[PDB]
Point group: C2
Chain length 169, copies 2
Amino acid sequence: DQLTEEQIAEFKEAFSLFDKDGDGTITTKELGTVMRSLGQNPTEAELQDMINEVDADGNGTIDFPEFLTMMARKMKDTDSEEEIREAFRVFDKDGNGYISAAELRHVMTNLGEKLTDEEVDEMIREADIDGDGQVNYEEFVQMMTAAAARKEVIRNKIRAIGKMARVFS
Amino acid sequence: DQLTEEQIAEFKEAFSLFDKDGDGTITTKELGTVMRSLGQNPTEAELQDMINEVDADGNGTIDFPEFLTMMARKMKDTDSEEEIREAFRVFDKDGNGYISAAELRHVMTNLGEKLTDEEVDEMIREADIDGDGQVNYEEFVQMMTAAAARKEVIRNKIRAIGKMARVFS
Ligand SMILES: [Ca+2]
Ligand SMILES: [Ca+2]
Ligand SMILES: [Ca+2]
Ligand SMILES: [Ca+2]
Ligand SMILES: [Ca+2]
Ligand SMILES: [Ca+2]
Ligand SMILES: [Ca+2]
Ligand SMILES: [Ca+2]
């Protein structure tokens, strides 16, 4: 659990980006100014929701350690949504927005992932929420977010493909 | 250092992704197989260059540690290009592919970063190569990639921005 003196400076930099007056805390106003500069236009209310999720001491503002938490939570969530999406892309050959049992079977076999056709058929059956025989994005996401589970092995194979697809391409 | 059995399990899965036949080394042929499936269509000299760029023992294939090196490199580059791209998208308010002195001043002020008329001025002069008085994507990247150390501070605030913009949406 070390800590590079640089990595610290970076969190300091992210923090100062929000704390304009530099008193050590992040007020809603401050969060908003930044938020707008990036895109969204959250309401005095929507902003408060962000604070609460990290407000450890519940004093209304965001201190460095709390921001640190928020920072991480989002770094993880953002990184995740990206590799899952990237993976979806790698599977949805035709790009029509679905993943036919063919697309799935082929990719997994072409990567030397070694998965019995049954396991692949099972994978689909389980992810197929609406039962249309294919996997849409929502259903793919769910599958990568959810006992006698060897489905965990499959998820790790897929997370790697996603991560790889990003890192490279 | 701070290494967990989770990271280890991740790199193994990644390496295994490339080592189709599980022999402990990744060949130019396997690199290609994964790369094509990942969407790209690299060429023979392009694969070779990838391997020689990390082939410490120079045996023509890639073993685990060399792969780790490759991974760290690609990961660092990818994260950099994304943060920088996002930062540019944040400054280019009108989204015309250029960043005028106005925009640069707007965003830096809004956030909480210094930059007086002179600072924003030299910054643009330094980065502007074609001399059209502005800063396009190319120049921006080159500038973010590099006399006082003042420049270094501005570059760092810009990275935090790229980083934050990405992490928030
Ligand atoms: Ca403050
Ligand atoms: Ca607090
Ligand atoms: Ca499809
Ligand atoms: Ca379905
Ligand atoms: Ca091999
Ligand atoms: Ca080697
Ligand atoms: Ca512009
Ligand atoms: Ca220019």
